């Protein structure tokens, strides 16, 4: 199947009419904007691996190396819950769209799922999803009974919290799958894999619908555009790029020509014109997603920034980092 | 308002329950046990990530044997970069299990995230190599091509095996001292006997001291 792979390279990337920079040449940009650290959500005591913005735009979880999962109030810098984890080598976290469930995944090949609004007042694990053979790299939430999960053995699952077992399993990668993100139209998701490839899977069908390439190093950051028709990746080769689902090519390449440190996290805005990006040079960046510029710099960390997200309404930007300091920008 | 003056008294009790759980994950020197392939990595001290623990003279050590999918080490190794020392056990008997460790030592040392961590290189099954030179097969000259010109300074006793075991140890530290820059340096040993539960505490005191020489401006 060597020559059949060239049939995709002539039907997905050769059908381009132009580039994306020729579209956004005459567009008035944001030019130069600046965020500012409103809050400083201190309290963690090790490297912070993942955060997830809640549905009401005033709650967020944060997963850190010290074995704690902590829900915050983004207004009054207020901790809501302390969730002590089983295995402290956690690399991902999640927040349900209902706001009742959170879920972590670590090195122990296991997705725990915690219930926030129990009748006993605590936070307890609902269904512990064991069944992966590698480290868990990312986990999400479709509803309160469906959770997709990437892991470190080339397999993306699709669990069911009531039953407990994988209703689907997405095989077809070489290395690991390092990050995944569901769409707004929630019948599709995408996954950025550790073999420098990005796979578009499908929740309802079960097979991978598309496969995107182009990165040199391994993709450890993926997120959807809020229209559900595009997504932007970020790998360790210090370059970001935005693909598209209806065109299957690399339209926008968000390459910083003077940096060498690898992108760790990527999340679009609530409007689709602020590509936040958390790098390895101890500070974040802000990319105008239209014209591909460095419109802002969120330099407020001293170690590498590992997690970064923008709310549903568009209120804030909270970036966590390896110096245990998660910081809300606005 | 009695709501946010009590939803912030909650935040000052979830504050004080991490600085009492963060003063317990900073009292143990973590390690990273890392054998090659059935090289006696479980026979040096004695869920899916086998975390073994031991203490010697009131200093708690925690070793993290990662029995993952394979020995790729591409992404789970950066989670252990806040660690004191990697431990690289290798059986010195075989010759297909030494030249594979040479390819498995220039990946750990020449890296990006482990650039401040020093390997406490253990050597095991040397009493199955000294018991494999009296056998007289001894294909060290056959396996390693440049073995035949090697003296044996500064050492039962036999100068044929003393030149042999000092050859691979000088082959271990050859890829070490190429690019180490003084921040981290190998610490090779010799041994399957129980005299090495002190030989790590005696060696981690020269790993912290090589950091505090650079930390406190000496």
């Amino acid at each position: 199947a060597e020559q059949l792979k060239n049939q995709i390279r002539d039907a997905r990337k050769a059908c381009a009419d132009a580039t994306l920079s020729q579209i956004t040449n005459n567009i008035d940009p944001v030019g130069r904007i600046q965020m500012r650290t409103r809050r400083t959500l201190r309290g963690h005591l090790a490297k912070i691996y993942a955060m997830h913005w809640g549905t009401d735009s005033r709650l967020l979880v944060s997963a850190s190396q010290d074995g704690k999962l902590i829900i915050w109030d983004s207004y009054t810098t207020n901790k809501v819950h302390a969730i002590p984890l089983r295995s402290s080598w956690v690399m991902t976290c999640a927040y349900a769209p209902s706001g009742n469930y959170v879920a972590c995944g670590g090195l122990d090949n296991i997705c725990s799922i915690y219930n926030l609004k129990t009748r006993e007042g605590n936070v307890r694990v609902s269904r512990e999803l064991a069944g992966h053979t590698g480290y868990l790299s990312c986990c999400r939430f479709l509803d309160d009974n469906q959770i997709v999960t990437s892991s470190g053995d080339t397999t993306c699952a699709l669990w069911d919290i009531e039953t407990g077992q994988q209703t689907t399993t997405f095989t077809g990668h070489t290395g690991d799958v390092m990050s995944l993100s569901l769409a707004p139209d929630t019948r599709l998701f995408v996954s950025g894999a550790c073999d420098a490839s990005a796979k578009l899977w499908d929740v309802r069908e079960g097979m991978c619908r598309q496969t995107f390439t182009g990165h040199e190093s391994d993709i450890n950051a993926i997120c959807f555009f809020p229209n559900g028709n595009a997504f932007a990746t970020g790998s360790d080769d210090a370059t970001c790029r935005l693909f598209d689902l209806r065109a299957d090519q690399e339209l926008m390449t968000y390459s910083h020509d003077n940096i060498i440190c690898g992108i760790t996290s990527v999340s679009f805005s609530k409007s689709g014109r602020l590509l936040l990006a958390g790098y390895d040079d101890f500070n974040c960046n802000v990319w105008d997603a239209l014209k591909a510029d460095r419109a802002g710099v969120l330099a407020g960390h001293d170690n590498r920034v590992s997690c970064l997200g923008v709310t549903d309404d568009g209120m804030a930007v909270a970036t966590g980092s390896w110096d245990s300091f998660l910081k809300i920008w606005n | 308002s009695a709501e946010d003056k009590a939803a912030a008294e909650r935040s000052k009790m979830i504050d004080k329950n991490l600085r009492e759980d963060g003063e317990k994950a900073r009292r143990t020197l973590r390690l990273l046990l890392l054998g090659a392939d059935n090289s006696g990595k479980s026979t040096i001290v004695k869920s899916g990530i086998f975390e073994t623990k031991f203490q010697v003279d009131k200093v708690n050590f925690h070793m993290f044997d990662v029995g993952g999918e394979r020995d790729e080490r591409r992404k789970w190794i950066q989670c252990f970069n806040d660690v004191t020392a990697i431990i690289f056990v290798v059986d010195s008997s075989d010759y297909n299990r030494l030249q594979e460790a040479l390819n498995d030592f220039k990946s750990i040392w020449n890296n990006r995230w482990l650039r401040t961590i020093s390997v406490i290189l253990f050597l095991n099954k040397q009493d199955l190599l000294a018991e494999k030179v009296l056998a007289g097969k001894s294909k060290i000259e056959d396996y390693f091509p440049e073995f035949a010109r090697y003296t044996t300074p500064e050492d039962g006793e036999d100068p044929r095996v003393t030149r042999a075991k000092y050859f691979i140890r000088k082959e271990f530290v050859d890829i070490s001292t190429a690019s180490g820059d003084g921040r981290h340096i190998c610490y090779p040993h010799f041994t399957v006997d129980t005299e090495n539960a002190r030989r790590i505490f005696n060696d981690c005191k020269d790993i912290i001291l090589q950091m505090n020489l650079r930390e406190y401006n000496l």
Epitope: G121, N122 | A2, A6, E9
Partner: single-chain antibody, 209 residues
Framework: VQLVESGGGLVQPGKLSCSAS????????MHWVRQAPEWVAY????????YYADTVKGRFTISRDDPKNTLFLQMTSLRSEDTAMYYC??????????????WGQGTTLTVDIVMTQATSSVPVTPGESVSISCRSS???????????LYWFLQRPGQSPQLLIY???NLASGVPDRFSGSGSGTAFTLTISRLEAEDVYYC???????
Amino acid sequence: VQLVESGGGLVQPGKLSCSASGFAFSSFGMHWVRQAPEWVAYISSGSGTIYYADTVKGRFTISRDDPKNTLFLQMTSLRSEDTAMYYCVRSIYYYGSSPFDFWGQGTTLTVDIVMTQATSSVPVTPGESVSISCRSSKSLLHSNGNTYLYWFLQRPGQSPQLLIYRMSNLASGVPDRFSGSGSGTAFTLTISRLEAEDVYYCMQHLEYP
């Protein structure tokens, strides 16, 4: 999931114990609302905040206890105003939380901001979409914007519950026939499609008595 109080002491004027068997009561506030035939305290978990009552404020004490969850009051100069049924509340606050999502027992011991609507003699008939409306003086578009509003459910049974917290939202364990709408310094509560087992109370929460 469960909570209980104990007591109902009949004594001359001048200690009723709770027990949260099955709860996380080291992470709960502990009120005691009177509603005599309106609080006592707000002893929060991590006892550095003990409010007291408008009738005494220096006695009728109430002592926190964490491990066995021994929330009680102390009988210190009991008056004829606390001759009531104290409902210990499993209320604790964070953005998303429901004060009075759970409630204790009406232990029934027979010992400020004005939101005045008594209406204490109203017979009930089913079918009609009735609407009670307790409005208040100050604009409850607060500094945090969260209205500490007044519509708490009850029943002919010996223990209360909650219908409409922050003038709109429904509690845990109660039905969903209750509802409501509002604006600044107002509330129009729409309790419609009536049925059997449907008193009713409206009190504030903004400041300690």
